[PDB]
Amino acid sequence: TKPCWYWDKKDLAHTPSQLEGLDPATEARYRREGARFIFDVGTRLGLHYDTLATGIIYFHRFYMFHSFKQFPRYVTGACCLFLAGKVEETPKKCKDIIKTARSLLNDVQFGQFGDDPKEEVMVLERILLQTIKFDLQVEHPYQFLLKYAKQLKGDKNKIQKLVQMAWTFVNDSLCTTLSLQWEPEIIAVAVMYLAGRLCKFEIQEWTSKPMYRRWWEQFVQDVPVDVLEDICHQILDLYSQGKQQMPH
Amino acid sequence: TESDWGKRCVDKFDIIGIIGEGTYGQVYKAKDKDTGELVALKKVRLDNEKEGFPITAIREIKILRQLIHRSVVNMKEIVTDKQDALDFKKDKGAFYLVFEYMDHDLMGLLESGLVHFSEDHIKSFMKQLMEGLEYCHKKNFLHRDIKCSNILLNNSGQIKLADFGLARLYNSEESRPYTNKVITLWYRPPELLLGEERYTPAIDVWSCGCILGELFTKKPIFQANLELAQLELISRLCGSPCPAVWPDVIRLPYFNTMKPKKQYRRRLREEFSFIPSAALDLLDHMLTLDPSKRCTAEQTLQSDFLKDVELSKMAPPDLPHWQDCHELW
Amino acid sequence: MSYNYVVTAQKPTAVNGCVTGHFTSAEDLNLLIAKNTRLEIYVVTAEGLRPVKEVGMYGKIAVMELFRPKGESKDLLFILTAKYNACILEYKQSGESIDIITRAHGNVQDRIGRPSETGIIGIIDPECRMIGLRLYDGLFKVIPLDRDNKELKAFNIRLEELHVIDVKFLYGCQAPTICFVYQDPQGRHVKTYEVSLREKEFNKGPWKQENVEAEASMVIAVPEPFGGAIIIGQESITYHNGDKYLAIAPPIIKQSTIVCHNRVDPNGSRYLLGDMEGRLFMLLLEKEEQMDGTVTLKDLRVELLGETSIAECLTYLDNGVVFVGSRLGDSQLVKLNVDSNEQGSYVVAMETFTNLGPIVDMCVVDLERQGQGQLVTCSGAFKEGSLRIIRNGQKLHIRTVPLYESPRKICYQEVSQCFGVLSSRIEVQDTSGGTTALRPSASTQALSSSVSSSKLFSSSTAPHETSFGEEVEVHNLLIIDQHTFEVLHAHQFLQNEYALSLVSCKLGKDPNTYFIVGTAMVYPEEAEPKQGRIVVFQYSDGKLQTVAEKEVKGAVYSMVEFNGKLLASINSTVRLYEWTTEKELRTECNHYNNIMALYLKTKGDFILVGDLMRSVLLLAYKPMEGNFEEIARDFNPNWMSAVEILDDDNFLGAENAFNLFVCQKDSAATTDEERQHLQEVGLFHLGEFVNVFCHGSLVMQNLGETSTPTQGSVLFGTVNGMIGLVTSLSESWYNLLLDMQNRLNKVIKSVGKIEHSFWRSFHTERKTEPATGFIDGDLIESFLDISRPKMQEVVANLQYDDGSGMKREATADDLIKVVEELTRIH
Numbered sequence A: 001t002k003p004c005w006y007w008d009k010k011d012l013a014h015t016p017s018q019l020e021g022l023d024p025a026t027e028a029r030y031r032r033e034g035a036r037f038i039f040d041v042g043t044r045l046g047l048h049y050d051t052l053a054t055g056i057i058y059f060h061r062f063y064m065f066h067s068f069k070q071f072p073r074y075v076t077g078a079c080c081l082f083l084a085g086k087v088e089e090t091p092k093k094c095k096d097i098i099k100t101a102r103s104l105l106n107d108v109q110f111g112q113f114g115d116d117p118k119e120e121v122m123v124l125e126r127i128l129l130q131t132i133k134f135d136l137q138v139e140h141p142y143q144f145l146l147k148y149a150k151q152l153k154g155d156k157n158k159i160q161k162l163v164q165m166a167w168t169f170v171n172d173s174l175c176t177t178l179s180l181q182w183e184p185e186i187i188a189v190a191v192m193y194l195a196g197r198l199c200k201f202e203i204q205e206w207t208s209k210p211m212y213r214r215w216w217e218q219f220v221q222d223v224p225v226d227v228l229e230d231i232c233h234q235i236l237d238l239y240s241q242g243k244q245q246m247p248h
Numbered sequence B: 001t002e003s004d005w006g007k008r009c010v011d012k013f014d015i016i017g018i019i020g021e022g023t024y025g026q027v028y029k030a031k032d033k034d035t036g037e038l039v040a041l042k043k044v045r046l047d048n049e050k051e052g053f054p055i056t057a058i059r060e061i062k063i064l065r066q067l068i069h070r071s072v073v074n075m076k077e078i079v080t081d082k083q084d085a086l087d088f089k090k091d092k093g094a095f096y097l098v099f100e101y102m103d104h105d106l107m108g109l110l111e112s113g114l115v116h117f118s119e120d121h122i123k124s125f126m127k128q129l130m131e132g133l134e135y136c137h138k139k140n141f142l143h144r145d146i147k148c149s150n151i152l153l154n155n156s157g158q159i160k161l162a163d164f165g166l167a168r169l170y171n172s173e174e175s176r177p178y179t180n181k182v183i184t185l186w187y188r189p190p191e192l193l194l195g196e197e198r199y200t201p202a203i204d205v206w207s208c209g210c211i212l213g214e215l216f217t218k219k220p221i222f223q224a225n226l227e228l229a230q231l232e233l234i235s236r237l238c239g240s241p242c243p244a245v246w247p248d249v250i251r252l253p254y255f256n257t258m259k260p261k262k263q264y265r266r267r268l269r270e271e272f273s274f275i276p277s278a279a280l281d282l283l284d285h286m287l288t289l290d291p292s293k294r295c296t297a298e299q300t301l302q303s304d305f306l307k308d309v310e311l312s313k314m315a316p317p318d319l320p321h322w323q324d325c326h327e328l329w
Numbered sequence C: 001m002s003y004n005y006v007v008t009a010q011k012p013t014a015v016n017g018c019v020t021g022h023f024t025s026a027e028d029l030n031l032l033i034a035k036n037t038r039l040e041i042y043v044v045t046a047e048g049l050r051p052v053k054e055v056g057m058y059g060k061i062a063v064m065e066l067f068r069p070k071g072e073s074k075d076l077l078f079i080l081t082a083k084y085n086a087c088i089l090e091y092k093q094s095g096e097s098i099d100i101i102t103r104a105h106g107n108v109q110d111r112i113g114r115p116s117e118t119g120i121i122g123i124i125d126p127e128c129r130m131i132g133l134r135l136y137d138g139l140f141k142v143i144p145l146d147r148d149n150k151e152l153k154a155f156n157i158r159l160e161e162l163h164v165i166d167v168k169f170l171y172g173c174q175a176p177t178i179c180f181v182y183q184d185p186q187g188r189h190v191k192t193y194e195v196s197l198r199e200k201e202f203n204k205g206p207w208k209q210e211n212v213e214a215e216a217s218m219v220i221a222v223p224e225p226f227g228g229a230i231i232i233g234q235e236s237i238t239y240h241n242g243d244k245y246l247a248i249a250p251p252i253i254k255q256s257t258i259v260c261h262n263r264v265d266p267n268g269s270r271y272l273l274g275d276m277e278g279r280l281f282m283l284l285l286e287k288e289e290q291m292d293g294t295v296t297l298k299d300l301r302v303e304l305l306g307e308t309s310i311a312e313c314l315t316y317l318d319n320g321v322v323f324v325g326s327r328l329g330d331s332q333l334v335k336l337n338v339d340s341n342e343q344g345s346y347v348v349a350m351e352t353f354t355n356l357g358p359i360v361d362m363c364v365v366d367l368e369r370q371g372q373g374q375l376v377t378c379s380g381a382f383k384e385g386s387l388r389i390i391r392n393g394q395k396l397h398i399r400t401v402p403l404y405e406s407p408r409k410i411c412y413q414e415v416s417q418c419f420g421v422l423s424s425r426i427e428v429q430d431t432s433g434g435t436t437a438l439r440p441s442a443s444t445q446a447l448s449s450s451v452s453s454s455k456l457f458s459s460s461t462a463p464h465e466t467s468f469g470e471e472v473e474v475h476n477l478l479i480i481d482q483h484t485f486e487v488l489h490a491h492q493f494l495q496n497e498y499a500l501s502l503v504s505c506k507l508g509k510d511p512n513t514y515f516i517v518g519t520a521m522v523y524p525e526e527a528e529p530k531q532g533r534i535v536v537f538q539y540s541d542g543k544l545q546t547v548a549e550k551e552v553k554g555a556v557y558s559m560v561e562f563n564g565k566l567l568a569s570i571n572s573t574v575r576l577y578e579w580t581t582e583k584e585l586r587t588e589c590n591h592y593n594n595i596m597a598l599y600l601k602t603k604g605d606f607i608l609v610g611d612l613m614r615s616v617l618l619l620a621y622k623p624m625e626g627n628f629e630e631i632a633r634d635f636n637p638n639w640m641s642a643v644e645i646l647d648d649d650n651f652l653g654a655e656n657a658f659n660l661f662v663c664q665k666d667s668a669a670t671t672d673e674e675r676q677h678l679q680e681v682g683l684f685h686l687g688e689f690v691n692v693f694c695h696g697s698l699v700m701q702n703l704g705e706t707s708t709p710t711q712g713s714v715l716f717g718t719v720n721g722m723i724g725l726v727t728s729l730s731e732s733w734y735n736l737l738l739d740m741q742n743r744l745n746k747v748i749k750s751v752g753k754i755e756h757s758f759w760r761s762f763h764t765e766r767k768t769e770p771a772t773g774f775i776d777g778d779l780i781e782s783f784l785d786i787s788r789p790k791m792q793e794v795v796a797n798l799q800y801d802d803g804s805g806m807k808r809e810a811t812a813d814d815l816i817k818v819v820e821e822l823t824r825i826h
């Protein structure tokens, strides 16, 4: 019926990219760059956040089936956004994505697009569609972050600080393979859980079950804390690997 | 696995012929070589590459995989032509959307006009259509192109909606600007004729309302060639749009522009007096001018006309297959 | 775009209705006969009919009634066309000048309504206060006959009884009153209402509902001496008038359905009744006068008079003379005698008016090696069935060959100097368990005979029970000599086997010429036949030999010879068979993308397929591969009655809505989608039901015939007996003829003031399109009949194009010459 889009962390040691001699740090870097390319390009074009994420999820999924050495990442990124726009009904013309990609890429990077940028991107659409098995519908942590926050009642200002801090964590998790390890519902909870710890908030008090210390179980059944901690640790790992610090 | 779409080859189907012309390619009738099932293949051509893959098809793939209902057409898989090449970037081979084959289409069955539709046949037909629309509306999807040709019927009496090419998600909280020229003039609601963007799901109800009337006369209700003439015909029957019945009609762009000849009174019950009482009241609510006062799909299912219809007792319309050829002397 | 020309070679002959009255003068007795689109006016004499006037109307005549409102000297005529064009007409004669006046006119179509099952009904009040029209279920339309209603404006009264069978205005009522039989789930009932022009609604009627026979068919309004109404059914005749109720159920009428009625005595003492088997009865109202001075109806009696042609309409004229208007066979004048003849009959035929009847099939054959061609039709039905031989000689010469059974298909086999004809006759389940024919006919009066002994469907595990009295069709292949039209041989097919298709040809390397028949096993239980045969016969030495049979899983609706191979359509499938050296049929290739492959035509390696609802599809045989290919399909949905190929690119079709259309290959190689699109470039409302298209012409060809502008020749036969001809034009010739039509339509006065452009517009219940690609040759050929002032008016400012001279002005004498050449194609 529907395909399975989630792998175990241990499985990422065997992406095509890894087995062609790319080391783990480099593939992680390529993923961040490709995702942030998609993010930045679409933001310049004024695209809805769902459209950016959908392109990123396509991009992440794509390189579970192909190697970064045979498919230049920024071409792939551009193509993903193009289709993402048509899927999410925020369409853009391919020529406009190229224009923006050229504005943001230097001369070396734009070399990936070859002699005809538009053609290289349009051609890849066939491969992308077959790669993602035409499973175009994608859900993202954002909608769950809001669906669950709406059910929190309490200090308007403390809850809004939680939401914005968690939202930023969602934007940052798109640069990672979490999109490939855990369903979005878990991500939304994980980012709430992380923002709560950082803000010294005890979310259970805002739930309909204020003495249910595991506040998330009423939102997402069957989630081990270990899973949430693994996700949080991975988000904070990205924050430490940079110079940037937690938003607070 | 069954989910790995886009890889299986169209070699696996014996093509029977071209049933019809679609939007993004021709539609073909075919038989699966392995199982013997009849399917309908919609050809999607990306060779033009003006915008690559057609969005119309993207909507049909995105939505119809989510939607599973007895009265919605089941997309089975997507198959491709032989690459004919080991290297990509040289492939123009098209993709085919596999659907369940449907024996007949409603317009086709009507255009012959010797099809007889009793009250019980209409009950069974309409209930399935509304149940499918309700399924789609609960999932917050708008068909936006409901016409007779889009309704499909096989001989068992099963009704299935199809051609979701223009379907898009509707958000009640966030008003979203829409295209505003989506439904065929004959089945377009007065709100769209007045250039109302951000339309409600009630547009689909109006179209299904025009069909309800059409099934009792065998003739479409509002036949016009131009947007103004259509508003006039609707007005001769439903009454002219005016704040008296449509408080927000003044906000619609073309209200001061597209005035009908007169400010007509509503005659729907008079010109349809030959319709059963349970059905006629359903029509009046479905053909209500103000989309905020127009009934919903769920409300149609909770009507005296459709509430107590039994889904099991399909009651198929009698279709002539012998003695139709030679007219009885 | 494509350009074509359509003319009538023989006008409609079937009688669709007939009335009497005082229409031409308050003094004369008139007989108005309505054939499809044609009105014939006669005057009754002591010998027969004197014709006085004939007009054509731009519409099918649906209602025809004579009435005389207070203040008029003579009867006026009301006519309503099938496109709902209404009008009131007057006859006016000025010495030698006869013309028809349009006194009132308009179109009474409703924007919303469901057309009724029993068709348009029109009746007029005895006091001529209003015209009643039943056009839609649940509605009764009233045209009040006031002097000011020159546009025939009308209003609808809501009618509760949705399914109405028949209605009449009653005699002897204080107010205008209607009597109608209607059907609801509890059976059929007779009910009455009063019509109020002041209130514009119904009021409670004079007498209560009575339950009537389930198959109550017709309502008779009886004149004032008795009053009330008579209800005719299948088994019983009943009279109702308030509390009075009578019922006679004589066994004689049960045998055949009664279809027509007419009053003989203005008193209402006597009526005529006719039934489908052609019998003519007298219905007698026996009076009894009471001491009040009042006369009541004592009893009803039915007396058989004799046999007439199966009549759509009867009308008694005067003395003993009755006009029999027949749709299935020849119309008649018959005299009713007081004394029976030695055979017991009171009916003796006077005159016989030719009716080509329903033309089920036909072929063109040069019987006398004349280069001309004679047209041989399958005409009529049941006892009226016949072949007709038709040749030009200025009128058509027509020989009639009676068959007394229904002819279905005809094909000519020259090698055998004879015709093959498929036929079916009606037998009835009898007390022997078998069946008995109601009369002898061609398939029983054959010189030599044979009966199929095929064992193919011999298991017949599925039971088919028979009840005494039920009808069955018995199908035969007739071998008929081309000079004498003697039935040389009759082959009877299997029980419940229908013969649907017939060809004569040679196959493969086989030198023998065969008759091949395609059949279907028809059982009342089956929605669609699932068994059938292709049978190969050889007619040799006065005997028909069964050569080979091929079983098929369906009905062989159509067959045609295809480059020495046999092309047959079985239900949805279109199949190509080869004829082996072992004299058996062998399948080569199949095509399945059809709903029902009803009609087939070929040209070269191309095949045109006519479908029940999917219009026409162009196939091609690809010899390099040994299979079929789909070339192009007409996606617009049309119900087909007959198809024909005009040339390698244009295709002609006939719709069940009485429409003609022409499809062409788009011949644009931009997209494979365009090539596969057959574009409907010709649309034309014919007004007739086309059963058969046939290439050929009846015009004598001495080879000296001037080459006419028209190219090609297709004849077609219709249900009303009308025979037509379709031919092609050059772009230059079409534009001239078309520009001239628009000029003629402004000049020529239409009966009922019906716009010609409206009449010829393509029309279904769901669509109306302006005609295109077709020249109404009958309009063009009327230029020769208009007065000189009108001719010169037509040619004013008329220019020619794409000719020797690019722009060339036309004169009245110029067009008379062109039209006269166009009259020579038929």
Ligand SMILES: CC(C)c1nn(-c2c(Cl)cccc2Cl)c2nc(Cc3ccc(OCCO)cc3)[nH]c(=O)c12
Pocket (backbone or CB within 6 Å): B017, B018, B019, B020, B021, B022, B027, B040, B041, B042, B073, B099, B100, B101, B102, B103, B104, B105, B149, B150, B152, B162, B163, C593, C594, C595, C614
């Ligand atoms: C792809 C599937 C969902 C589909 N599509 N369509 C369609 C629509 Cl939804 C709109 C316009 C035209 C067509 Cl063909 C469809 N029609 C129909 C009705 C239909 C039309 C023609 C048929 O014989 C052609 C004989 O040469 C048989 C059936 N049956 C479908 O299955 C279908």
